[PDB]
Design a protein around this nucleic acid. Structure first.
Ligand SMILES: [Zn+2]
Lengths: 49, 1273, 27, 49, 99, 49, 49, 49, 49
RNA sequence: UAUAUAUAUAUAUAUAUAUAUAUAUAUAUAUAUAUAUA
RNA sequence: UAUAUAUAUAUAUAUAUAUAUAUAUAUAUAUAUAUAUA
């Protein structure tokens, strides 16, 4: 692989690592609440293992 | 040749030009064209006197035995039927009768006649039976004669003109002179003998004359009488004579065809007789070739890549043929001979068989023989009374051998019934398959995307349409007052018009209208019954959406639609070639009448139930396409019935099933018959266009899969067959499209399956289809028939008879067209002769003669003036016809693969450059100041002297008149617009997107000062395009015609001395040709019949490049960025603009505005805009930015690798450094390569390496000017 | 029948023409 | 090219594949005719000498 | 030899496909500012005389009859002796020979 | 006097010239190259009975 | 040789060495079986040295 | 589709004891490829994420 | 709805030593086949029962 | 005029292929006779 | 009247043998034309 392209590829991967996305926070803190509430609403209760 | 002396002086000159004696010029071009338009057509027959025929053909007097027409027609239930003579109920075609007694005399030409005004009046007013029967007979008989692109006599004149003088040889070592000669053609001698009956004082009265309104006939004297069949016989003879000459066949085969036609013409119902013994020729030749001992030769070695879904094939050498590989199926001689005995034509079979036995080994001669003999079938567009056609085709119902018992269904769900689990068999398989697909469709956020919704609604509108009257009645019936826009001059029956009326109305109000009548149409065919066109109304088309969607998913996600993606049709070419190779055994199958066999009682009920059940998984309250959820009564439980909501999709099914159960209600209004419109229902599926192929292909695949995996193993007997039948699946053994299908067996190990097992296998399949009422119509002859393409041992066989030189379909009593359209007919006509491989030299000669006649035309005001015009011959060069001989050159040096448009011009000039420059210097004084490409020698004046500019600009002029607008009609235009926009923009988000994009775009384009006035594709203009199309579909007023002629003449007369800016710049490049490229395949192996050393240029072009499209790294640019687009806009315009912007280095927001202008949301717009790059783009993808495209003629050749690594844009040791493109090469090199390969393809002979040698200006200057032009447009 | 423009040799079958054409024509 | 462009089916079992492939090749007395010809050749040669 | 080769090619499970190699080749990144592209050269050289790819089986079959006939490298494939190692097309030919 | 006579003269006399004003000798030359390549094909792939 | 091209040449050569071809395995393990079987089929037995 | 897969994965958790979400087979790098084949590498990256 | 085989087997019991019911030869999985071929596996199961 | 080479035509001999006629064998169809069954 | 079997006659198809004709290839002889040499 020509290093120039290699330099580019590591660059774009670096950019992805630095995006200030909100999803990881939402998964850890907010999504469980939504599930906990909706579990009492669906016609079929949750069925887990 | 005394015939050459018989020709008038201008025609003698033209013949000399066509023979290559002299360079063609506008002068003689006009003289020939003019004189043809003024002399009576009978003189062409008069020319035949000067041919000393020496052929053994006798025309029996049995032809002139007119059967009385009065017994061939009757009316019952107030409809004029055909009352067949023979007990066969299919004898519904035109009889053999003397039309004479029904003729008056014309005031213009007293000799010929037309129908009595008394007869048509009584049939119209009194509805008198005999009057109506006579009228109907006259109309259809005239129509059958009209099924020609122009008058046959003119074509005969063309053939005589070209054949009047042998062509001059070129200097090429492969330029074989014609082996065939006149005075040996049975066809011409036959024409002579039969025409001897039609002369009274050596005048040779034509039996009929075609006119724009049909055809007229000549009143016979008291002694004689003219049978309509004679006219048809002449057309077939003329067509055969032309074809035989072009295909260069032995006179013996032509003799057989003449006897073939004569025997058919002798009996009654010339059409019916021909139709009965249609398949005789292919069966005698194609189906049975190598059933002998001395078999051998070379054959292609084709391999199918592992991801078979992609349909990728590789040429990988050749295979020696031997006896173990010879075909296994029984020959076809016995049945054909048995049939021929009926018409006492056994001699034809004996002649054909004996001649065939002279080709025991597979080579060029064998396939060439096969091509020629198969070219003998009649090329007539058969036409019958539409009333009989509709009555004969839709009167069929499938016969099911094991119907689903009524006890196999559950309780109703309002309309549908679910299938009980306990039921097994093919029906269960079908039910599960559709149900599974319905489930996948059920949850799919791909829909409810507003853009996708726009696509579906827009897909429903086209310029054509029908059933508008039924629509207006049904809605008016329910109290719905639709708008009208008549002042906007657009046809009411157009699907556009009805769509505009619907835009405002709430959809559910329209539900009652889906159960309304549907009009119908008929399109004639060459070798079969006429096809049917059944356009639904827009509402019905909308309701049936779930059926289409599920079918699409079944296709695209099971057997990848079996090529029904139709991306390029050429993907079937390598497929059949591979399927016909010796190692593989192939079987051709097709449903007898899939349209007539799909029905509700068995099929549609199962599908409706499966779809309705399959949609149960999903929100019960979720409207779809404006159809809300509703409450339906569930009665599955007799003890606990109730009602529950159902989603909109299910509501659609509820109505759709109701409609299917009720059956389609058609209304026939045939014009050829007289006053006999009526309506009758049928279960026949509409199947009017490609929208039906999806459903039939899905069911086709499903039944086949169940047969292979379940039914056959459980039922077949041969253990060996079971062993090979297993380990076989449709995804790698079967393909189909609609009714048509191909089944290929796994490679039997160095061997072939016993014909005994084949018979067992084929028999069981027939019974399997018989179970649910499908006649499978299978055959096994070790050949490949798929989508009307024929392959034998990996060599493609063009079935030329399906493209008759003279024949052309016309579905209405009137041609309804204007003179300039004939030019496009000529262009399309010529291309077929290239697609099909004919003798390229002779075909070119005939083509120019056709062009010369077409070059001239006129028109007359309904009351007032006349108008006239004609083109300089250089137009046709620009349109894509190679010149035969330029001044200073040698004839026949330009190949038919010469590209049309600017590319063809550039290549011609590039070769012609040096002679022009030097000659101009001697002949003319120098121009006053230096020129970029020319020296001071001033060639442009010379080109004007040749009228090149006139032709170059004339071809640019439009050829169909334009309708005029009006202001109160513009209120309707706005009303039409508003409603079309309203129908298009059902929601608001799309409208906001487009408006923002347009506003930003013009703001950027002006402020950044890229340019102004750039017509960028945008949704706001889609309704405008629709409106223009709708108005264009109307018959133009005469004033528009007068404007056309005046404008055209002015464009011709205006003295201009410049081409388009692109062509001007293109001339700055110098290209040279090196040695021949390394060969693709062995020249011994035939790949296309007729592309042999005899037909050298085709043989060269195919051999060098190889036919199999094998773009392993190019992909021919099919990866367009915008996969999803709305109708009306052009993808090829969109990507061209995007690349042009990218080359211009526009800021990203420019791309954002453009993308947002076609509905793309900002997020995806950024996503799309980022993908745009000069690297991933393909050569053709980027080269199209300046309209440099690949000619259609090249689509059958493997041009990819050549363009990639054989067109050197910069060879270090040859190119001048001035031409070094430097950094801009990233987008400059593809352009140069395209120009180079275009020039290389232009010249005749083998393909050579193409090299740029010099640009007169610096490459930098060229790039700069190109960037300017790119910015300008 | 078929013929070669360089030497006027005439051939009954095209295969014979091909093999001849390719092999017989090339101080 | 043949050396570098060799590939097969994903989960090939050679014994099975060859089992199907060779099945038709051992169905007849073809191999034995040459044995019979060899014997006759032997007798003919000796007698001639 | 021909009989065995054709018979052999019928039963084998091996399949040849030049495409996989070309993809591996073309995926190589390179600059567009160079006067010569090795990629184009080797691709041009890589395609056989015809699109034949049959010599491989011919070599296999010959082994069963090496007493009768011997395969030999085609004489025309050798690099020209007058060239030098820096002449890339000659260099590639040498590589194919030793392989 | 005739294009035929001129064409025959061009093929015969100027059989090896390279003047741009003439086309046909070059094409014939290319055809000769075409044949030589054709020899290269069967020379390593002959035809068996 | 300019190093950029030189870098390219070693790159493409490396790519060839990394292709996961099947042929070498087939030669060592499967081809001998095919020969051994076919040796009993051809009209002419093998003739080796 | 506004990324139905994401919400689909979340919903599946509530009924993991009944249904399991799996990565689609097509969304895999072909086993015949090398690490240097960029599209294959990106695919593997997405699978890991 | 015939089930002739079932009754045939029962009847044959009273006449063993005169007629013997045997499993259909073609009902067996092919010998060359492998266990991984599911249709063959089912045959073996039914054969066992 | 003679000799050599090339092409064409005729005659003779040999070999292959096709067609026709005659003889023998096999298969199919039709007609007649006998036998059996319905 | 129908079906099956056997025998006889006629026609068609296939194979083998003999005769005749045509075409192709090879060899020999003769004639004609063209080129070269004396
Ligand atoms: Zn020649």
């Amino acid at each position: 692989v020509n290093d120039l392209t290699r330099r580019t590829m590591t660059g774009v991967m670096t950019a992805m690592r630095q995006v200030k996305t909100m999803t990881p926070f939402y998964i850890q803190h907010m999504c469980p609440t939504e599930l906990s509430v909706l579990a009492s609403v669906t016609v079929t209760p949750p069925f887990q293992v | 040749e005394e015939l050459f002396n018989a020709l008038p002086q201008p025609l003698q000159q033209l013949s000399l030009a066509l023979a290559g004696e002299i360079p063609l010029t506008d002068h003689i071009f006009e003289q020939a064209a003019s004189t043809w338009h003024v002399q009576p057509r009978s003189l062409t027959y008069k020319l035949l006197d000067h041919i000393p025929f020496s052929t053994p053909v006798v025309v029996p007097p049995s032809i002139y035995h007119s059967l009385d027409w009065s017994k061939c027609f009757a009316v019952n239930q107030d409809r004029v039927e055909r009352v067949p003579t023979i007990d066969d109920p299919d004898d519904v075609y035109v009889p053999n009768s003397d039309i004479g007694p029904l003729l008056t005399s014309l005031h213009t030409i007293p000799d010929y006649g037309f129908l009595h005004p008394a007869i048509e009046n009584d049939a119209t007013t009194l509805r008198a039976e005999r009057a109506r029967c006579a009228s109907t007979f006259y109309k259809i008989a005239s129509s059958q004669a009209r099924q020609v692109k122009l008058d046959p006599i003119r074509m005969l004149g063309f053939l005589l003109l070209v054949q009047a003088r042998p062509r001059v040889p070129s200097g090429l070592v492969t330029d074989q002179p014609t082996r065939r000669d006149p005075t040996q053609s049975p066809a011409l001698h036959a024409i002579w003998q039969v025409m001897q009956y039609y002369k009274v004082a050596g005048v040779y009265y034509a039996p009929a004359l075609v006119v724009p309104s049909g055809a007229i006939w000549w009143i016979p004297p008291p002694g004689k009488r003219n049978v309509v069949s004679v006219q048809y016989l002449l057309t077939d003879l003329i067509n055969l004579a032309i074809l035989a000459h072009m295909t260069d066949m032995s006179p013996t085969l032509e003799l057989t065809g003449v006897l073939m036609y004569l025997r058919a013409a002798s009996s009654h119902s010339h059409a019916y007789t021909l139709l009965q013994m249609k398949s005789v020729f292919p069966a005698l030749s194609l189906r049975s070739m190598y059933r002998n001992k001395g078999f051998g030769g070379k054959a292609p070695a084709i391999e199918w890549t592992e991801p078979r879904s992609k349909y990728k094939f590789r040429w990988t050498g050749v295979t020696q043929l031997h006896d173990g590989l010879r075909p296994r199926s029984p020959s076809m001689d016995v049945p054909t001979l048995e049939v021929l005995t009926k018409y006492e034509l056994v001699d034809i079979g004996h002649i054909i068989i004996r001649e065939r036995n002279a080709h025991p080994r597979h080579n060029h001669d064998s396939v060439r023989f096969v091509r020629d003999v198969m070219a003998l079938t009649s090329g007539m567009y058969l036409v019958r009374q539409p009333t009989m056609s509709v009555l004969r085709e839709y009167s069929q119902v499938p016969d099911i051998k094991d119907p689903i018992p009524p006890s196999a269904w559950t309780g109703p769900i309002g309309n549908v019934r679910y299938l009980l689990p306990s039921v097994q068999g093919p029906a269960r398989h079908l039910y599960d398959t559709w149900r599974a697909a319905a489930r996948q469709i059920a949850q799919d956020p791909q829909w409810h995307d507003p853009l996708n919704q726009a696509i579906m609604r827009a897909q429903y509108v086209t310029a054509r349409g029908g059933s508008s009257a039924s629509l207006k009645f049904a809605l008016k019936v329910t109290g719905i007052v639709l708008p009208e826009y008549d002042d906007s001059k657009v046809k009411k029956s157009s699907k556009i018009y009805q769509a505009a009326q619907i835009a405002r109305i709430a959809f559910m109000l329209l539900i009652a209208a889906i159960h309304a009548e549907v009009t119908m149409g008929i399109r004639n065919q060459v070798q079969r019954r006429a096809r049917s066109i059944m356009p639904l109304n827009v509402i019905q088309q909308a309701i049936s959406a779930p059926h289409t969607l599920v079918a699409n998913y079944i296709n695209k996600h099971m057997n990848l639609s079996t090529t029904s993606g139709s991306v390029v049709t050429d993907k079937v070419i390598p497929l059949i070639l591979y399927a016909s190779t010796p190692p593989n055994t192939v079987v051709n199958v097709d449903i007898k009448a899939c349209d007539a066999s799909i029905t509700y009682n068995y099929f549609l009920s199962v599908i409706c139930g499966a779809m309705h059940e399959g949609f149960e998984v999903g929100n019960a309250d979720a409207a779809f396409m404006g159809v809300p959820s509703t409450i339906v009564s569930d009665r599955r439980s007799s003890v606990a019935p109730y009602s529950r909501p159902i989603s909109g999709l299910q509501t659609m099914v509820q109505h759709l099933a109701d409609l299917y159960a009720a059956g389609f209600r058609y209304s026939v209004s045939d014009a050829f018959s007289s006053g006999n419109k009526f309506s009758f229902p049928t279960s026949t599926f509409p199947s009017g266009s490609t929208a039906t192929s999806t459903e039939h292909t899905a069911n086709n695949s499903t039944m086949m899969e169940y047969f292979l995996n379940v039914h056959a193993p459980s039922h077949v007997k041969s253990a060996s067959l079971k062993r090979i039948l297993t380990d076989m699946t449709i995804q790698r053994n079967y393909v189909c499209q609609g009714d048509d299908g191909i089944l290929l067996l796994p490679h039997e190990a160095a061997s072939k399956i016993s014909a005994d097992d084949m018979n067992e296998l084929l028999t069981c399949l027939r019974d399997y289809g018989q179970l649910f009422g499908w006649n499978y119509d299978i055959d096994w002859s070790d050949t490949a028939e798929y989508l009307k393409l024929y392959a034998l041992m990996g060599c493609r066989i063009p079935n030329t008879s399906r493209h008759p030189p003279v024949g052309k379909e016309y579905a209405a009593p009137q041609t309804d067209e204007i003179w300039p359209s004939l030019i496009d007919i000529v262009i399309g006509h010529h291309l077929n002769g290239v697609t099909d491989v004919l003798n390229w030299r002779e075909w070119l000669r005939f083509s120019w003669a056709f062009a010369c006649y077409s070059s001239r035309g006129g028109y007359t005001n309904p009351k007032g003036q006349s108008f006239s015009a004609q083109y300089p011959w250089w137009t046709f060069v620009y349109l894509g016809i190679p010149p035969i001989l330029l001044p200073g050159q040698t004839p026949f040096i330009h190949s038919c693969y010469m590209p049309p448009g600017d590319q063809g011009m550039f290549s011609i000039l590039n070769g012609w450059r040096d002679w022009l420059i030097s000659h101009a210097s001697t002949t003319l004084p120098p121009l006053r100041h230096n020129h970029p490409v020319w020296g001071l020698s001033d060639v442009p004046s010379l080109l004007s002297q040749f009228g090149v500019y006139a032709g170059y600009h004339a071809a640019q002029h439009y050829r169909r008149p334009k309708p005029a607008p009006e202001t109160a009609s513009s209120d309707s235009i706005n009303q039409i617009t508003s409603d079309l926009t309203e129908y298009l923009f059902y929601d608001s988000a799309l409208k906001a997107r487009v408006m923002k994009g347009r506003y930003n775009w013009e703001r950027l384009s002006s402020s950044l000062s890229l340019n102004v006035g750039s017509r960028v594709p945008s949704l706001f203009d889609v309704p405008g395009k629709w409106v223009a199309a709708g108005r264009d579909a109307e018959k133009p007023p005469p004033s528009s015609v007068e404007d056309m002629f005046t404008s055209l003449n002015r464009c011709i007369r205006r003295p201009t001395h410049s081409f388009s800016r692109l062509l001007e710049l293109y001339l700055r490049v110098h290209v040279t040709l090196g040695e021949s490229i390394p060969l693709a395949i062995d020249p011994d192996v035939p790949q296309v019949a007729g592309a042999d050393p005899a037909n050298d240029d085709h043989w060269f072009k195919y051999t060098c490049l190889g036919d199999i499209p094998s773009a392993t790294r190019n992909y021919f640019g099919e990866s367009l960025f915008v996969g999803r687009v709305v109708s009306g806009l052009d993808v090829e315009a969109v990507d061209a603009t995007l690349l042009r912007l990218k080359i211009l280095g526009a800021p990203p927001e420019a791309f954002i505005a453009v993308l947002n202008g076609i509905g793309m949301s900002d997020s995806e717009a950024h996503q799309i805009a980022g993908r745009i790059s000069l690297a991933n783009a393909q050569l053709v993808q980027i080269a199209r930015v300046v309209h440099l495209s690949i000619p259609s003629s090249w689509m059958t050749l493997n041009t990819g690798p050549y363009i990639h690594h054989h067109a050197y844009d910069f060879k270090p040791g040859i190119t001048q450094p001035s031409a070094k493109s430097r950094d801009k090469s990233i987008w400059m090199s593809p352009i140069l390569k395209l120009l180079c390969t275009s020039y290389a393809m232009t010249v005749a002979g083998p393909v050579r390496t193409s090299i740029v040698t010099e640009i007169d200006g610096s490459a930098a200057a060229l790039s700069g000017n190109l960037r300017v032009w790119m910015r300008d447009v | 029948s078929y013929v070669c423009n360089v030497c006027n040799a005439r051939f009954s079958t095209m295969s014979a023409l091909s093999e001849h054409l390719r092999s017989d024509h090339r101080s | 090219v043949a050396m570098l462009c060799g590939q097969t089916e994903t989960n090939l079992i050679p014994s099975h594949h060859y089992g199907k492939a060779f099945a038709p090749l051992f169905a007849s007395n073809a191999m034995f005719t040459r044995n019979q010809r060899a014997v006759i050749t032997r007798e003919a040669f000796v007698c001639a000498r | 030899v021909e009989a065995l080769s054709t018979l052999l090619r019928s039963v084998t499970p091996l399949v040849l496909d030049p495409t996989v190699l070309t993809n591996a080749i073309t995926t190589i990144s390179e600059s567009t500012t160079q006067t010569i592209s090795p990629i184009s050269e080797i691709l041009r050289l890589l395609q056989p005389m015809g699109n034949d790819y049959a010599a491989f089986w011919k070599c296999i079959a010959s082994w069963a009859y090496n007493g009768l006939v011997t395969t030999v490298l085609s004489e025309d494939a050798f690099p020209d002796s007058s060239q030098s190692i820096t002449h890339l097309p000659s260099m590639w030919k040498c590589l194919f020979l030793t392989l | 006097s005739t294009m035929s006579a001129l064409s025959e003269h061009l093929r015969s006399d100027h059989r090896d010239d390279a003047s741009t004003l003439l086309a046909t000798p070059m094409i014939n030359n290319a055809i000769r190259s075409f044949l030589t390549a054709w020899d290269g094909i069967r020379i390593l792939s002959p035809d068996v009975s």
